[PDB]
UniProtKB/TrEMBL annotation, chains A, B, C, D:
Mg(2+) 1 binds at residues 167, 221. It is an enzyme of class 3 (hydrolase). Keywords: Hydrolase, Magnesium, Metal-binding. One of its GO terms (cellular component) is cytoplasm. The chain holds residues 73 to 414 of 414 of the full protein. It comes from the Eukaryota. The lineage of its organism: Eukaryota, Discoba, Euglenozoa, Kinetoplastea, Metakinetoplastina. Its EC number is 3.6.1.1. This is inorganic diphosphatase.
Amino acid sequence: TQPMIKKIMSRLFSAFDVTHLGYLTPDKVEEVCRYLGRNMSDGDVKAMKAEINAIDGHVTFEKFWAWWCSHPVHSRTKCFSMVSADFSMPYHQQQLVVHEKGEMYTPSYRVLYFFRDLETGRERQVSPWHDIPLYVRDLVRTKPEATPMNRYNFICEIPKWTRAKFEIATGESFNPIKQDIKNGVPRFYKHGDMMWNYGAFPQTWESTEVLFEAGVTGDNDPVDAVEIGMTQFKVGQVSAVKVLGVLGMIDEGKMDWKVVCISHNDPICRFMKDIHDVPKFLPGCLDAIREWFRVYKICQGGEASHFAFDGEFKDKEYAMKVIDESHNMWHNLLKVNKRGEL
Amino acid sequence: TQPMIKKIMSRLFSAFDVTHLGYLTPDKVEEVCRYLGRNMSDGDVKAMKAEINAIDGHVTFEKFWAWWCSHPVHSRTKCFSMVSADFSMPYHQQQLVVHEKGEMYTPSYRVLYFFRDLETGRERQVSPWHDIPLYVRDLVRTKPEATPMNRYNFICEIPKWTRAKFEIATGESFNPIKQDIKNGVPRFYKHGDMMWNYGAFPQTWESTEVLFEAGVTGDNDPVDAVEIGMTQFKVGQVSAVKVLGVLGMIDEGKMDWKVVCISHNDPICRFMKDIHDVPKFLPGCLDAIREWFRVYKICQGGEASHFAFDGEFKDKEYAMKVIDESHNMWHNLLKVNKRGEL
Amino acid sequence: TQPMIKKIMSRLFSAFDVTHLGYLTPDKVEEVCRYLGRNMSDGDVKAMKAEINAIDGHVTFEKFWAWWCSHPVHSRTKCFSMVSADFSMPYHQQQLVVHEKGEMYTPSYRVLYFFRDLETGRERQVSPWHDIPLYVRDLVRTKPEATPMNRYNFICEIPKWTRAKFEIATGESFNPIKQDIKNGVPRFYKHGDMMWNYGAFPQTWESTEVLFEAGVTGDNDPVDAVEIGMTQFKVGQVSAVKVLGVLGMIDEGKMDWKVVCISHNDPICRFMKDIHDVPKFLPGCLDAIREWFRVYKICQGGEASHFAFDGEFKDKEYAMKVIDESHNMWHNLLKVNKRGEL
Amino acid sequence: TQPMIKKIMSRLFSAFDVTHLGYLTPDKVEEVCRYLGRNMSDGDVKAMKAEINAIDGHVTFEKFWAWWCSHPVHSRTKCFSMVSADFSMPYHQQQLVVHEKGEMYTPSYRVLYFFRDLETGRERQVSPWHDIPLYVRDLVRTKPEATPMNRYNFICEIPKWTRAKFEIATGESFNPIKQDIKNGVPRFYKHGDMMWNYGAFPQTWESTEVLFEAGVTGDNDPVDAVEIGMTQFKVGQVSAVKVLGVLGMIDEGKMDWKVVCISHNDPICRFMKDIHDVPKFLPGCLDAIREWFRVYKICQGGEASHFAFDGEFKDKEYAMKVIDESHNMWHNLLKVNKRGEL
Ligand SMILES: [Br-]
Ligand SMILES: [Br-]
Ligand SMILES: [Cl-]
Ligand SMILES: [Cl-]
Ligand SMILES: [Cl-]
Ligand SMILES: [Cl-]
Ligand SMILES: [Cl-]
Ligand SMILES: [Cl-]
Ligand SMILES: [Cl-]
Ligand SMILES: [Cl-]
Ligand SMILES: [Cl-]
Ligand SMILES: [Cl-]
Ligand SMILES: [Cl-]
Ligand SMILES: [Cl-]
Ligand SMILES: [Mg+2]
Ligand SMILES: [Mg+2]
Ligand SMILES: [Mg+2]
Ligand SMILES: [Mg+2]
Ligand SMILES: [Mg+2]
Ligand SMILES: [Mg+2]
Ligand SMILES: [Mg+2]
Ligand SMILES: [Mg+2]
Ligand SMILES: [Mg+2]
Ligand SMILES: [Mg+2]
Ligand SMILES: [Mg+2]
Ligand SMILES: [Mg+2]
Ligand SMILES: [Mg+2]
Ligand SMILES: [Mg+2]
Ligand SMILES: [Mg+2]
Ligand SMILES: [Mg+2]
């Protein structure tokens, strides 16, 4: 009798009121009985059609539900096994829900994430880091099996044209987004605005236990992403992106890959197929990204950033390896060592 | 010990070889034992670490698999419950696979559909009509809960700029795509080429038992769709589309809605938000569609088509109602009345 | 006193009524006299200011014009050389004007072209064939001198998705567009609709006096163009296109090049840089174009079309050479031999 | 005998060597004499053909030119009026040429502009401010007379994602672009990078003699433009833009309009039709522009900028009026008062 069962029965009802009259015609009443009764004889069935006929007026869904719930929970469940097979969903869709706890630009501000199970309606808090899938996987993959997958979830921490340095709080339960703290106050970029959507990939971690080719360990954070599309995102907004390449930034002695990606919703996504297409269609974009990350902390007392491969942006095949490997590291962190907070 | 278990263990292994060295270092050997052994003491554990140390040379995944499979299937399963929770997929992705049975443009030609379970690797034949989801539902829905869904699977039967009249064979098991037969020969449009991708929505049916507002029943086929993007699709190709509106075509006395939609991969999808945007950005497109469907059978001995609403293209809210209701009709056809073939 | 002179004086007037009060303030009246009066005697300047101050009410432009036209043709002549240098246009822009003489789809239908000189206001009829520039040349070319030009005027005779075979009438004075006549009636394609904007390049001619490399002479018509953008054009509409390549069609034994081009207003024009990009971004488009032109006359009793280079689409460099050479032929036809009608 | 005459004769030559054999066949030699010779005596035509036939080897253009230049200035004069009418260009296209005088980021750096007359080949230095047309006007306007014009030349001083404050030097002859000087050194924005292409409209001037509606005079500079397309421009690059709206910025007590525009080469230009479409397709763009200009000088010791209309972005109709009026002011500055340098 739970809300999940009610939705199943609601879809069942629609198969007998396809045109949404709002009620069951007499013919439809006999038909839903012939259907529910399929794993019965007439003993429990005779009692069923007689019961529904004795309802007063139009058999609305609401009255049909009432009739259904009035039966004994055991006998219901026998025929319900058929109903459930035909009318339950393949999987329960989870709606990502975002809530703010004010006040923005002060240390108290948080962006919290929840799941709303669309079948049960139950809400639970989740971690944008651990619980948002890194890979966007269709239940039924219709794109041809030849073309390989390139659809990643990107969590936007810092929208295009802004400079409040929001971050997934790796140290707090459920890892809400917060504003980073620098010199005791909420941190704003001093160098200038972030000129692309900036954020991170969920279910990745720049491991402090891994010696990257560059001779350093990781910066202890989710893998960083720069989304170069034309649309400004909201803080905490999550959207599907295509990975194009990656910059081997070494930041304060830690590996700090910067993945270049573009929203699958951008008008030029189709035409950007690897890192080399970015100079062709967005000349100066890669140079500006490399330079911004090279110098941005200098005005803050830091030093110029170093880069592996002499600052070369590696291609997408390489970037997806980097992401895959940080997914493994994240598996080791959360699944194996049970660390949900740093 | 099945292929599904092997993939689970392969992802497990990667969490202890994150950098893909191809083997387990000594430290990693102790760690995978501390992990597998978490629901054990030392009795079954002592036997475990001793067993893995006694492997010769580098513990490759292949040797790790061998060691794992050599244990007694019961004791394995106790710790495996933990492994399965951490490293099994949320759901099994199904790869849509298409096979042709030649020869094209003859009556023998068929396009068959299969599912390849990507975890088990098992293939089964499926119906493009019944088994391809009508609605494209993300497991975790990241688009904000306010913006409503508009992502439908479109099965292309007739590609842009062609005239071989392929159709889902509603009368055959597994409903392969075939070429329609007219006057004893494989059917080609006489009027001209189809100038947009033409096909159908899976899990819909223009019910022969429903009296549509127009005073007729349906044409006994899946709901028809015209995809107006610039890209030509392959025969049988399935892709995600956005519904914009619908034309109330009455064809030979049957309701024969023609849904106007556009590929979510087209460069101008973002800008087309309802049926009214089509004349703005694709002037003449709606007029040509209405006219082509109005007259195309006349040169074949048929009559001009009629249209409800005096030929008005209804908007997307209306088109999605039409699609929703034909989904209900399809539920009644397949689930309730158990008809997989017409 | 021409309307041309009036517009010059209107622009002069605006330079002293910059915010468009609609009239001259006293200080502005003194300033326009000091301007008109260099280099004249103080006698003529003071008398000039006096003539204008003696105007009744507000010195609107319309009254300023009146004063000017009443002024003596002598004093005018000396300063007007200055005025003309400062305020005359570099060249007179001609506005293309299109008029129909009904009735459409009958032999009487004509689309006529005119020029309206925006400075003199005089309208004169012109030939879309002879008088519309083949090359679109900016007065000041701002694109870098490195980038070679690829901006051509395309005259649409047959809009996307239509089949009325309109044509520039090479045989009639001013070469209006008419519907071709086949078998005594206005001609419609029997094969199907034209699925791209179809038309011709002005100031070109497939010479009947030239033996093309293919061993045949030309089809005696302007060079044919297929514009593959997503937007449908109106009959007779002229717009700027980018040339991509050309198909060496031989039609009924005559050279009948089919240039592939795309509108500079199309959303994907920037990404289409040569003929090879068409299969990348519009798969099937080239094949469909070749096939349509190969077979369309067969159903009319004609023969399959032939193609040079085995049906290969030559690239944009080759296509521009063909166009340049047909431009030379047109120069010989019109300028040298004075043939405006065939 | 000018290089201008040589190009005329080159085009004439091509009209008799249409396929570019590179020389004149005998029949073509007779034909060019019959052309040049109307209307002359048979004596002069036969002697002319004889002069050219008496040429050694193949009559290439280069030798044809030689023959022409040696011909007697009398006979030339009579036919050349015909030649000039048939083969001279409507107007001489000027190619914009840009030269740097290093060294960049020092006070010595200059970007100079030239015109190369494509017919005469003569190069002369020009002012990007005065000599580049504000309005982009086609010789033959093919867009329908209904559509009003919205095609302006934009001079980029500060490319997208940069912060070197380059400026048209209003104080120097020919008004080269230089880096602004602030506090004795070449000026860089302290606030951050300019996140859109920034520059100015040629042939405009924010007059110091005009009391703007806001109750202040102008900032004595060309009108400022922010180009919001996705493509980064080079310093000094000139390109055609579509005007969308304008921000009524008051900067240090002076009127300092900020016109919002977008490149006619941008993929989404067609879809942006007025200022209201910018929030539809580039959310946050307007807010970010207003805010950047509001605060950027504060970190330099300056004050927040003021805005007329409470910071509202006025629409494109209003923006074009502002531009038209600043064009009038520029006419008064340059043409009437002869001020090319401030
Ligand atoms: Br050009
Ligand atoms: Br224009
Ligand atoms: Cl998880
Ligand atoms: Cl995918
Ligand atoms: Cl910082
Ligand atoms: Cl199903
Ligand atoms: Cl959705
Ligand atoms: Cl048919
Ligand atoms: Cl025909
Ligand atoms: Cl190009
Ligand atoms: Cl010729
Ligand atoms: Cl500054
Ligand atoms: Cl517009
Ligand atoms: Cl002024
Ligand atoms: Mg940080
Ligand atoms: Mg980070
Ligand atoms: Mg960092
Ligand atoms: Mg980082
Ligand atoms: Mg059919
Ligand atoms: Mg159908
Ligand atoms: Mg039908
Ligand atoms: Mg149908
Ligand atoms: Mg013809
Ligand atoms: Mg033609
Ligand atoms: Mg032909
Ligand atoms: Mg032709
Ligand atoms: Mg300045
Ligand atoms: Mg300025
Ligand atoms: Mg200023
Ligand atoms: Mg300014």
